[PDB]
Amino acid sequence: LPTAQEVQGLMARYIELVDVGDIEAIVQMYADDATVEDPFGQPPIHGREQIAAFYRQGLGGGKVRACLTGPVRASHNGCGAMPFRVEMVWNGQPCALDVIDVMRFDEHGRIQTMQAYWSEVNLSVR
Amino acid sequence: MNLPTAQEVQGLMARYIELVDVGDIEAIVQMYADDATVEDPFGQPPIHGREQIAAFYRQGLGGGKVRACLTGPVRASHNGCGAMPFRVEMVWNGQPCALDVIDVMRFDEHGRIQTMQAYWSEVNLSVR
Ligand SMILES: C[C@]12CCc3c(ccc4cc(O)ccc34)[C@@H]1CCC2=O
Ligand SMILES: C[C@]12CCc3c(ccc4cc(O)ccc34)[C@@H]1CCC2=O
Ligand SMILES: [Cl-]
Ligand SMILES: [Cl-]
Ligand SMILES: [Mg+2]
Structure with missing residues (x-):
């Protein structure tokens, strides 16, 4: 597994x-x-096609920006968690969304699972 | 309470x-x-279980002063889970150090923590 x-x-x-x-x-x-x-x-x-469709729908238009808001936390069993902020435009309202992603990597350094923690309580109008 | 809302x-x-x-x-x-x-x-x-969890926290917090503070907002789901970033400050080798951590928690139908997972390793420990 990938190191920390x-x-x-x-x-x-x-x-x-x-x-x-x-x-x-x-x-x-x-x-x-x-x-x-x-x-x-x-x-x-699940599946490469569906994952691509999800990112295409989310990022397709451009106008999505993302940046870490603190360090990546990493374990010794190939997993990590990170805090970041997504900036986007939602029907003319410029918005920001605070997110934490948790990821588990496989023995080739690929993402095996991704879980994104956020809801409407993490949305803000800029 | 019931299963906690976001x-x-x-x-x-x-x-x-x-x-x-x-x-x-x-x-x-x-x-x-x-x-x-x-x-x-x-x-x-x-x-597993409150007795062992008590022992863990008493070992971790029962000695030198530990401080903890959120470093950004709590992220919450609609199924009773959340994740948060925070920093723990304590002492190591007589000098202050800081540890950056993310906890993920799942709550039950009574508003109590059912599982907690804490993500950190030595790459998240800093000094000076
Ligand atoms: C999908 C999305 C843009 C990107 C994005 C969102 C949420 C969580 C994410 C997690 C990621 O690891 C990568 C991208 C996103 C937004 C929710 C609404 C939206 O337009
Ligand atoms: C135990 C500890 C202080 C508290 C603490 C640590 C690590 C993760 C934590 C996660 C928590 O949800 C609450 C407290 C801690 C530190 C690791 C070494 C140390 O001094
Ligand atoms: Cl942080
Ligand atoms: Cl944050
Ligand atoms: Mg129970």
Whole structure:
């Protein structure tokens, strides 16, 4: 499994890819059988095509920005958690969303699970 | 209460940090379900039940002064879970150090913590 230092680098790279909006590069970071729960509480998304569709829908228009708001926390069993802020426009209202992602990596450094914690209580109008 | 709403999760998890900061072990243990599990750090074997959880917090908080504070908002779901970023300050080698942590908590139908997972390792420890 990736080391704690490697998890920090992978999760930071993921945020960099979200921020520039490269959907294909993001999808490549996921394992074949990965699941995404975003927001956590909703049914998982499974499969490369469906994960790509989710990022295409979320990031498609451009105008999404994302940045870490504190350090990546990493374990020694290939998992980590990170806090970040997403900036977007929701029907002409510029908004920000505070999120924590929890990720579990496989032995190849790919994302096996992703769980995103947020709800409407984490939304703010700018 | 019942299963906490997202707003209630934010309040419960913020209170937990206040109780860590002041070091009220009994009040912390009362927030946990009787059969709760703690994984701290995540990756180590779970701790089961209030007796073992009390012992863990008394070992961690019972000695030198520990301070804890949120470093950003609590993220909450609609299914009784949340995640929060915070910083713990304590002493190591006679000097102050800081540890950055993210806890993930799942609450039960009575508003008590059923599982807690704490994400951190030595890469999150800092000094000077
Ligand atoms: C999908 C989304 C944009 C990106 C995004 C959101 C929420 C959680 C995320 C978690 C991620 O790891 C990456 C991107 C998002 C927003 C919710 C509403 C929206 O437009
Ligand atoms: C135990 C501890 C103080 C408190 C604490 C630590 C780590 C994770 C935590 C998670 C919590 O939800 C509450 C308290 C801690 C530190 C690790 C070493 C130390 O001194
Ligand atoms: Cl932080
Ligand atoms: Cl934050
Ligand atoms: Mg019960």
